[PDB]
């Protein structure tokens, strides 16, 4: 499956200036567009190479949309202040996530249209794309508002139509980047702990997309240990990184194996240094 997601953040800073507003567009796990009110002039700028193929009217319409949404979020911050009986001297945040995951075919798998106030869930469009789910009473006021006005219909119209079509277009244009599959380069490192045990470390570098599984099978299989495992992090060049470490007594190094399961690999890797 593939995804087109948009992440929007409005943060207030009383005494300084107007609220800072940012928009970030993602295809799958790769950022490709950005908006920021704290720039030389606020415009929708490209962040990937394949997206620069778009014409000037593309960026013009996206900039207009971002500025409209920024005004909306300013008003929203003030009304949330009124809603929660909060002082005008504090810094508050308003996050918004909207997007579509479609299957390999093209049918819409899932639509997202959710908001959060101060890092807490506010209101979210359900899976039916018709009804809303609110957290507290202010969000219930917002929900009854949006149900009178019927905003769910317009939001579902975006999620089922515009979003899917533009995701198909983005995949088609950036074929060379988005749908590539890079195999992980993996290796095992060794460290002597201050005691008699040693730390074995299984790496996986330079893979794309980020979906990978790193596991440690012992003499046979199973985990059965507090294996260390960091989250998949980005190397900053389009590829990703992961590693899993384990402790092992001095001598059993030849009895431990690492398994790398990645979609860009014909056969999962079995490893041991």
């Amino acid at each position: 499956s593939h995804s087109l997601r948009y992440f929007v953040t409005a943060v207030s800073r009383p005494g300084f200036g107007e609220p800072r507003y940012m928009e970030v567009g993602y295809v799958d796990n790769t950022e490709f567009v950005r908006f920021d009110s704290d720039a030389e002039n606020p415009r929708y700028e490209p962040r990937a190479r394949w997206i620069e193929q778009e014409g000037p009217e593309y960026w013009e319409r996206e900039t207009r949309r971002a500025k409209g949404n920024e005004q909306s979020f300013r008003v929203d911050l003030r009304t949330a202040l009124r809603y929660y009986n909060q002082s005008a001297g504090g810094s508050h945040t308003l996050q918004w996530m909207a997007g579509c995951d479609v299957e390999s075919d093209g049918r819409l798998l899932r639509g997202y249209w959710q908001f959060a106030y101060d890092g807490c869930d506010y209101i979210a469009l359900n899976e039916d794309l018709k009804t809303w789910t609110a957290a507290d009473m202010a969000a219930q006021i917002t929900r009854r508002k949006w149900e009178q006005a019927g905003a769910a219909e317009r939001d579902r119209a975006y999620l089922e139509g515009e979003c899917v079509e533009w995701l198909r277009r983005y995949l088609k244009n950036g074929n060379a980047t988005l749908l590539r599959t890079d195999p992980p380069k993996a290796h095992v490192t060794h460290h002597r702990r201050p005691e008699g045990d040693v730390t074995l470390r299984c790496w996986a570098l330079g893979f794309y997309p980020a979906d990978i599984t790193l596991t440690w099978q012992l003499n046979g299989e199973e985990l059965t240990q507090e294996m260390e495992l960091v989250e998949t992090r980005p190397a900053g060049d389009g590829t990703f990184q992961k590693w899993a470490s384990v402790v092992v007594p001095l001598g059993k190094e030849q009895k431990y194996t690492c398994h790398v399961e990645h979609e860009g690999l014909p056969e999962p890797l079995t490893l041991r240094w």
């Binding site: 948009y6 319409r61 409209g68 949404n69 909306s72 979020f73 809603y83 908001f115 508002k145 533009w166």
Partner: peptide
């Protein structure tokens, strides 16, 4: 393209 709030505030 991205989503538009369409000035429908909370």
């Amino acid at each position: 393209r991205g989503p538009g709030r369409a000035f429908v505030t909370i």
